[PDB]
Amino acid sequence: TNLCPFDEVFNATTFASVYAWNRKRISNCVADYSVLYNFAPFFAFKCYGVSPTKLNDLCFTNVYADSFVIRGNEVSQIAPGQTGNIADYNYKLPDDFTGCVIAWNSNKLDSKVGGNYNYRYRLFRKSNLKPFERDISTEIYQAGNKPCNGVAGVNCYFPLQSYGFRPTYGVGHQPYRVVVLSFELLHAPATVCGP
């Protein structure tokens, strides 16, 4: 009768940057989604693959507890088959993804007067991300064919820029915290069913 530790994840003091995604494997416990199924604080309980209306009777192999914080308008891009900066160079969802995306506004915790500068994102990349992949490289991006030579130069730019969240922004620019619960199931006994 081990309760999966979903709790300590939602109310953590801080979440890492957009490009430094956090992965936790949750296996060999019991997870009950009926706690938040009726509560509904979230603007979106949008789910894909599994219907939230009492489908916890099935068995899954592992649970991924992806978590981060982004801008508001970009919440959409956390959806299958959509292309935008966040999708292109930051986090990816396969079209076939099964699991739940839940998001809420947390301006109050995140926003700081004078700006909060601890959340960052990668503007340009040589190519596109492949599925569920992490790039933490800080090497300078080069657009020019002439060599960058490792210095700031014409057509040479550092990859990451800061969100700079501030209290007086519109609903689109205000910080939104996103948690993606992915139910990974393969050919396995799948002890993580969550009765």
Add this chain to the structure above:
Amino acid sequence: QSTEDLVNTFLEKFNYEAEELSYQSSLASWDYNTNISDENVQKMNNAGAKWSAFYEEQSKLAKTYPLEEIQDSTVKRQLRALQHSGSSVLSADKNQRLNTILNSMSTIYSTGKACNPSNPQECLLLEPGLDDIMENSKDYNERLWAWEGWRSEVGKQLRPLYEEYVALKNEMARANNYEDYGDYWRGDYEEEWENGYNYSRNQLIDDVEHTFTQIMPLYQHLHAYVRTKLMDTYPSYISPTGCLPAHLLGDMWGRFWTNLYPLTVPFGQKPNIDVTNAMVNQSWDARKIFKEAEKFFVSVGLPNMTQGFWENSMLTEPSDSRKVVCHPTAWDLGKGDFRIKMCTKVTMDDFLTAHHEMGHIQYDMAYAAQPFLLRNGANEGFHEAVGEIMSLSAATPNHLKNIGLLPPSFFEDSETEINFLLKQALTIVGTLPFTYMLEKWRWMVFKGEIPKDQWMKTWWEMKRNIVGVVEPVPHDETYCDPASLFHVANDYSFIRYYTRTIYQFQFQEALCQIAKHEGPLHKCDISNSSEAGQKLLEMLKLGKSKPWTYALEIVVGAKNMDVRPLLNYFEPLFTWLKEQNRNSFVGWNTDWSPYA
């Protein structure tokens, strides 16, 4: 790699860097304006510098990319803007000199004083004082002392400086490849596009001219009516055939003739509609005024205001300690924040003003999606116009009844209608001739048609021929009369005003047709019709992405300015005016002088 490719990456770097620096600058200005303290001034200055530094260095960075190579319209429009290359072209020493001259001139205007000949002690500055005499007094002699005075002291000082300014500016322009400074200014209305949407710099001159010729018959009649009425108040001075003497027209420079309403009311006994008293009776408050406005906008179809607006804006005169700048203003700080600052008192005029200001905000909200460089109105004129259209609708007798301010059974009469129209005309028709003249003089001076020796002579001649006003006292070359007006001495373009007016009416007629109004255009109300809103919205969203000509077409169906709509609005008045002056002479003879 195409330069197109290189260009697109560059443009992405700039976009995020630009918005954040701008927001900071803006926040600082709001703070100063709301709480005026010395410390605040400092912060504002520091932040502003950073933003400018960014723009300048970036602009310099981008003169490098060839303009011709890019083959997509949107990208091109953006690159062009960053590449404007204004002012930096001049050598540093020259730049420094120009800056000094510009500053000196602004100071003289603000601090200038003029004195009563009769009482040496009394000396008055412009804003508090000289203005009042001009605006409210009815004595011939008094008015004269003031007119001459501003001109004699502030003006004479300004002339030597102006001459230098003309030369330097012209040099700057020549370097940037426009022919003269005038061309640079007309450049704003220039568009290059493919299918018959092209407008050229030269064409503006022709169009303005054509339109004026059409408006002339109305002006002539109005001029006559005023003349006859004025004759009663200052009996000896005015002459039946001749032009109106200048000092008697209602403001120091003559721009608007509105102050003459008391003297000229057509049908005096019936009173104008004012709802101020009622508002007090029903206990409306400042927020109530704003709240009502929102409802109008919602009814047409545009979106409701955001939560932030309600919380952060300063809708009321600040109580207690802070000191506040008073102009009614609308602010788009950026990154989503929209705020309005004004002090509201429960008066009818404020109801009307609120509607205008909110209008400016609604446009802004709409163009947000477009990229940073392109987020602005299509041509300078459009922004103001959008706002005005809204106000006209609100003032109509019908709207006021529905809100409940007016009593239920009021029925207007012919007399009241005429009275309303005249008031409007003095403000709108009266301004148009003046604007045309000023701009023409300036364009010519810059080009070189008028030699320096003859600058003053020409000004007066032109006024007599086009606007029908004559000098009270002879003015020699040393004086520099055009300079006194604020815009002239603070380097701004004055064309925007003529164009805006023509546009407003055009928009209104079109919208009204969709809304199915039947009757005189003066009574049209767009309220409660969704369709109208949608059409306007389509234009608003474009921003500067597409050429101005294209935009006008979407709402009104034509690619060019036309003055037929204005004439229709004022048609009921025209007929009346014609009957009234049937006996009197219409026209002016340039010969008469009050110089005598």
